[PDB]
Amino acid sequence: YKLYIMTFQNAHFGSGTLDSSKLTFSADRIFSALVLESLKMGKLDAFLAEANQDKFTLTDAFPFQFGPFLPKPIGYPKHDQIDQSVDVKEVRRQAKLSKKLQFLALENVDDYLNGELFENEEHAVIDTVTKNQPHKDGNLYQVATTRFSNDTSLYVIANESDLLNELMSSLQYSGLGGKRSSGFGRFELDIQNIPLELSDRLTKNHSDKVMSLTTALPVDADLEEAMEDGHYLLTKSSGFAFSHATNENYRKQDLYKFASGSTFSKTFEGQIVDVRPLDFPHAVLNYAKPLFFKL
Amino acid sequence: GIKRLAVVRLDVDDLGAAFMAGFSRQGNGQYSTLSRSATFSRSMSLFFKVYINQFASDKKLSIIYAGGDDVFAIGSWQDIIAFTVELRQNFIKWTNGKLTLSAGIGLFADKTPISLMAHQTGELEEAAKGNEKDSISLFSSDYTFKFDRFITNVYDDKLEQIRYFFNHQDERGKNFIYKLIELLRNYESEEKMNVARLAYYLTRLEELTDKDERDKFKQFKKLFFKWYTNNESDRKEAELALLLYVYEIRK
Amino acid sequence: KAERAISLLEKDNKGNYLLTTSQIRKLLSLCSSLYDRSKERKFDELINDVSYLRVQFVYQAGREIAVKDLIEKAQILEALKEIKDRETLQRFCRYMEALVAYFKFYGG
Amino acid sequence: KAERAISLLEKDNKGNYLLTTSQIRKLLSLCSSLYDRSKERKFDELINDVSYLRVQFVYQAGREIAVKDLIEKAQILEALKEIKDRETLQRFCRYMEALVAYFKFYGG
Amino acid sequence: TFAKIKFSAQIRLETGLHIGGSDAFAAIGAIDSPVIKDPITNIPIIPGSSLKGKMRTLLAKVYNEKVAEKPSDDSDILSRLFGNSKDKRFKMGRLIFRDAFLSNADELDSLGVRSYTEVKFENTIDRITAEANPRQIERAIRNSTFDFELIYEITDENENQVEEDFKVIRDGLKLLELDYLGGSGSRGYGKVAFEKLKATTVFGNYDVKTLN
Amino acid sequence: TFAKIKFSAQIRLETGLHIGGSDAFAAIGAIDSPVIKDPITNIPIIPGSSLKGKMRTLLAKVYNEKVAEKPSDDSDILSRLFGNSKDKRFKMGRLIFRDAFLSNADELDSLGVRSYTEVKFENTIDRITAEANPRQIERAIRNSTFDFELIYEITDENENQVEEDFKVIRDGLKLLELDYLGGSGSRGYGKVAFEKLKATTVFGNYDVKTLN
Amino acid sequence: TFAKIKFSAQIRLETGLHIGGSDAFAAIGAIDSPVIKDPITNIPIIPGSSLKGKMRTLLAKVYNEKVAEKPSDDSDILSRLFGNSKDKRFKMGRLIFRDAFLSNADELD
Numbered sequence A: 001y002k003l004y005i006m007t008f009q010n011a012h013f014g015s016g017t018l019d020s021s022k023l024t025f026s027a028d029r030i031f032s033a034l035v036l037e038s039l040k041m042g043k044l045d046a047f048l049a050e051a052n053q054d055k056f057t058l059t060d061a062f063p064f065q066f067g068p069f070l071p072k073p074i075g076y077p078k079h080d081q082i083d084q085s086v087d088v089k090e091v092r093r094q095a096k097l098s099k100k101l102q103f104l105a106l107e108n109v110d111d112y113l114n115g116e117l118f119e120n121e122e123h124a125v126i127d128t129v130t131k132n133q134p135h136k137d138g139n140l141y142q143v144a145t146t147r148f149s150n151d152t153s154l155y156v157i158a159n160e161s162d163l164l165n166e167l168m169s170s171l172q173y174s175g176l177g178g179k180r181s182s183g184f185g186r187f188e189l190d191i192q193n194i195p196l197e198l199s200d201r202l203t204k205n206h207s208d209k210v211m212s213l214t215t216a217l218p219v220d221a222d223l224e225e226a227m228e229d230g231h232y233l234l235t236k237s238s239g240f241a242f243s244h245a246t247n248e249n250y251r252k253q254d255l256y257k258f259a260s261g262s263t264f265s266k267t268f269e270g271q272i273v274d275v276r277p278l279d280f281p282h283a284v285l286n287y288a289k290p291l292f293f294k295l
Numbered sequence B: 001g002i003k004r005l006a007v008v009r010l011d012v013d014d015l016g017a018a019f020m021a022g023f024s025r026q027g028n029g030q031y032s033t034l035s036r037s038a039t040f041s042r043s044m045s046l047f048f049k050v051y052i053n054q055f056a057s058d059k060k061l062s063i064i065y066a067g068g069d070d071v072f073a074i075g076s077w078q079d080i081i082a083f084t085v086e087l088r089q090n091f092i093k094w095t096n097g098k099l100t101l102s103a104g105i106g107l108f109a110d111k112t113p114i115s116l117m118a119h120q121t122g123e124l125e126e127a128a129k130g131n132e133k134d135s136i137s138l139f140s141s142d143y144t145f146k147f148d149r150f151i152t153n154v155y156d157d158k159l160e161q162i163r164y165f166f167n168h169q170d171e172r173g174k175n176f177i178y179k180l181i182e183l184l185r186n187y188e189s190e191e192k193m194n195v196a197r198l199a200y201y202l203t204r205l206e207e208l209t210d211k212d213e214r215d216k217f218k219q220f221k222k223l224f225f226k227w228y229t230n231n232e233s234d235r236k237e238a239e240l241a242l243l244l245y246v247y248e249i250r251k
Numbered sequence C, D: 001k002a003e004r005a006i007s008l009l010e011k012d013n014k015g016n017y018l019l020t021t022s023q024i025r026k027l028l029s030l031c032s033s034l035y036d037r038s039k040e041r042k043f044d045e046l047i048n049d050v051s052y053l054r055v056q057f058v059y060q061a062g063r064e065i066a067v068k069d070l071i072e073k074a075q076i077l078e079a080l081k082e083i084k085d086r087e088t089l090q091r092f093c094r095y096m097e098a099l100v101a102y103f104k105f106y107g108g
Numbered sequence E, F: 001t002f003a004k005i006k007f008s009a010q011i012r013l014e015t016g017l018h019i020g021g022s023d024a025f026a027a028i029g030a031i032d033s034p035v036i037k038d039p040i041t042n043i044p045i046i047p048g049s050s051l052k053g054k055m056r057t058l059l060a061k062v063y064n065e066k067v068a069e070k071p072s073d074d075s076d077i078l079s080r081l082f083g084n085s086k087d088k089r090f091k092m093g094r095l096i097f098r099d100a101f102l103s104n105a106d107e108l109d110s111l112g113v114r115s116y117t118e119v120k121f122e123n124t125i126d127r128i129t130a131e132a133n134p135r136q137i138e139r140a141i142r143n144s145t146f147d148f149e150l151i152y153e154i155t156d157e158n159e160n161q162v163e164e165d166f167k168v169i170r171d172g173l174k175l176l177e178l179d180y181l182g183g184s185g186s187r188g189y190g191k192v193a194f195e196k197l198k199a200t201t202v203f204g205n206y207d208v209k210t211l212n
Numbered sequence G: 001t002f003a004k005i006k007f008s009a010q011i012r013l014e015t016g017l018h019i020g021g022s023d024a025f026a027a028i029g030a031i032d033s034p035v036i037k038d039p040i041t042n043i044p045i046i047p048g049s050s051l052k053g054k055m056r057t058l059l060a061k062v063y064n065e066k067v068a069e070k071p072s073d074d075s076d077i078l079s080r081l082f083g084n085s086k087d088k089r090f091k092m093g094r095l096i097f098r099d100a101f102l103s104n105a106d107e108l109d
């Protein structure tokens, strides 16, 4: 509906452990950031009645290098396309190149299903930095960073309103993920109006071989009915909570969701799960609002 | 030496052949019997799971996860470098030079998390396959060679030649290698201008030494200048020889 | 620039370079004292150093035979007149250092 | 300064410079003894050295024929009157060193 | 209610410093820890962790009321500007830093210099022998501007102390210039100079008057 | 409580010295190690590494109580002024030096000299032959001021010893002038001269009275 | 314990000497090696390298106990006054010289 192009430079997005880092990040990082900063501004109760309005949703961090990128379809293609049958060694060595691929181009969303295999474009390299502490037994730690290159940018698709544009205006000067108390999260928001005439297949009604993204999460009333005959991949996303009145900061429960680009068969619903381990004066919200692409 | 350590991950490259359909050469024999394909895994399991303990003896390292696919050898780099290039030599004679091999040696710091320590050394494995299949990745992702050009050129008559034709010069003599490495990198923007500056460093070392010692330094000047203007891939070989010599004797 | 300096210096006459790096320890150092001053100030201020730098080349062409055969071949006096800009003056400083490196490689 | 010193010195009469660098080993050293003293003190103090420096040029133009033909052409006596400032006096010292370099460039 | 105060300035290095980076792969022409650079290009950069770990230590020794011992547990009047994992009144840091990138390359190549990092020869005297351990370091070049932006934001409660917060930040900027910023700065390697110290707003919710 | 004492002075080199520089490229007419300078420009500057290592060596032989053997482990009465990596009572040093830069170029060009450095010819006699090893060095020009600023700061504990701290610093300044500063200075190359020795305050916390 | 002895004197040249200085460019009337002076100004000065190299040579031939051959390795009774790059008992010298500058310009003019 409306994409928000933003580029990163020397950022950090861990996945499992603080020392490790990935080029992208899950969709729950953006939703858990605007709600945390809404209380500091003075409108936490205003955004609570907006996220639960069905039409309001968010997208994952997709690369943008002279064109929007989309994840590869999980399980596609099937066992029918061999792509130039020459030898069993040449066909087997090129099948892994598509497995290590991260995102596909906007113009290759239709040619990949017909029979085409190629190596993903080199977006950025994983670089790490070292730190220590002199007045504490000389201890040290290692953390990784993400330095984009070759004009590597990202974009998130949301809904146009007169309240969301002001909440994200301060996020570019406040950090986003990783070591926020250093400067690993500052970016620049490039606002736009017209997205693209091809990337308008986002629907949530009919079910014609759709594809769920942004880590799907089925509802209790529709789990196995949409899980049978599908392609998915279980991941992992958790960590310690961040509150201001606990004196302990309890651990959030595990929420093994899916991956960006899973192909099911029917249309889900999307709910908001509440993470309450012991007791908290507030409520740890979560995204869990997957979209669908016509493919 | 230094107080660091290196991690190597020797992994077999090609695996779809010699198991599915690769024994065909004559229409007489079928070359598709299950027994002919089952003896391939048994013949290589004795070298990657049994012969590893015998070949790693009398060394300052310890093999971990000695399987038929990927291994994990950790320890001091004083013996890992002499074990990675040596293990492949025994595999070529066992296979008559029909199966390639690739790996990657990368040093790290002390008291570091093993997560990124074992993940950064694994990224060099995938980066050592952009050319074709018989490549290698040294300490970084820029040293992309063919592995066979190391023990037959770099480790043969390049890295060894410095150990007895430059060891006589110490302290004062070790004030020129740190600059020659920088000249080997700045070659795209500074092409013809860098060639003229190379003729000056070759004369500063010969003039600043003993008169009787000049007899030893008589062929290193011509061999070092020829290795700079001959091939683009040959220019990167001098950066590896000058780096392993500094890590040898120092501190 | 650096292409015509590898073949013109080799083309000489009698072998065994009699001139060493000891009798030329002034004209090679005064040119380095102008490259660092050209990047700090303008070119219209250093008009007095350019006039004195040219005299050093002509003064040495009459006291030693190993200098006349180098100025007339490398065209040292010709390059001192074409310069007029700050960027052009910096090119003459780099061209002089190229003739010194190749002079010690073939001889000394 | 240096541009007009390469064409005026060449324009002479009979070839083979009879005047050598041995008979001019006084007037070329007195000018160097004034340039180094002008940077330490002022110009109003060295008023006695300027008067004695001019007499040496006139005294040499009467004992040798190789001096009268050089003063009247290079205008040596004219430049000794236009000077009046410390910066102007330093220009005459650099102009005299230029005529010595180009003198040995063609002969000796 | 909610403003965004950005302290944009240019850090001018009047003395070449030395900060040990990661491993030795971008500058293997030394014997000790080199200076961290950019993994894509080849420009010497400085991380943002060195700006917070040094300014907080030199500031917590004059505006404190108790002998410190462990971080995030000394002088509550300034603990809300950096971070604290113990007090419930504040957790986040209201002073977001940024990696200062060398933006002096737009006019450095026109003058013609050596490169980007030099090599300095150093040693030691054991008072019993001559030269001992001929080591060497890798300092930084002189005159190199940087992009330093200090982000400051209020959180509603920040009302009857905004004017007092500017006194600590302004005093901390001039205090860093009178001290080394790097490694082995006891002999005179650091000593920065904040040039063009100005402050502007981006969101627009607080007037500018306390510029200097 | 916390003051900043800066010893601003002008080092007047009455005799050209020589310090072993890095790469031999300041002049293409030398043969040995020249003098380290600036990587960007080419102005003869002196580093601060030769000031702390020389002032402490010439001072720890009169204000000590035990024969030294290794650095950073001799005379505890002055170890807190420089630094010690072994004592747990203190680690950082309270005497920050500064790389003195040549600021005499504002009036040196008006006189008209040759350049900035000279080449002195030296050799040796083996008492059996004539000239042996025709080498050469590169000294510095005479009369060249420098910007020397000694940054001093207290840490609350500096209370009942401030008057004793200035006695060692003042004695070390006049003692350095009676000895060479640099390498190969046994023949009389160093010998500095601190001109206009004054001390001012920048932070504003300690009164000035012991100026001289 | 620790004292500073300075032998302040005035060297009066009763005979004009000649020491081969640096490059032959102090005057445009010479052809051989002149005398080293000052790079900034122009006053004839004598360095301190010629004083240590001459006083030690003429003194090590009367206060010695063995025929010398190489410098810094003859007569241990006087090696501690200048210095020795081989003995482990001492390395620095206790006789710091000084480049003598001509101070007779106050009345020569």
Ligand SMILES: Nc1ncnc2c1ncn2[C@@H]1O[C@H](COP(=O)(O)OP(=O)(O)OP(=O)(O)O)[C@@H](O)[C@H]1O
Binding pocket: A092, A093, A096, B013, B014, B015, B041, B044, B045, B067, B068, B069
């Ligand atoms: N020691 C072994 N013996 C028999 N088979 C093996 C052994 N090691 C691995 N394999 C086979 O290799 C297969 C996995 O190969 P893999 O996909 O890792 O190769 P690859 O990484 O694609 O090779 P390349 O890097 O050249 O593309 C497994 O199915 C397994 O059967």
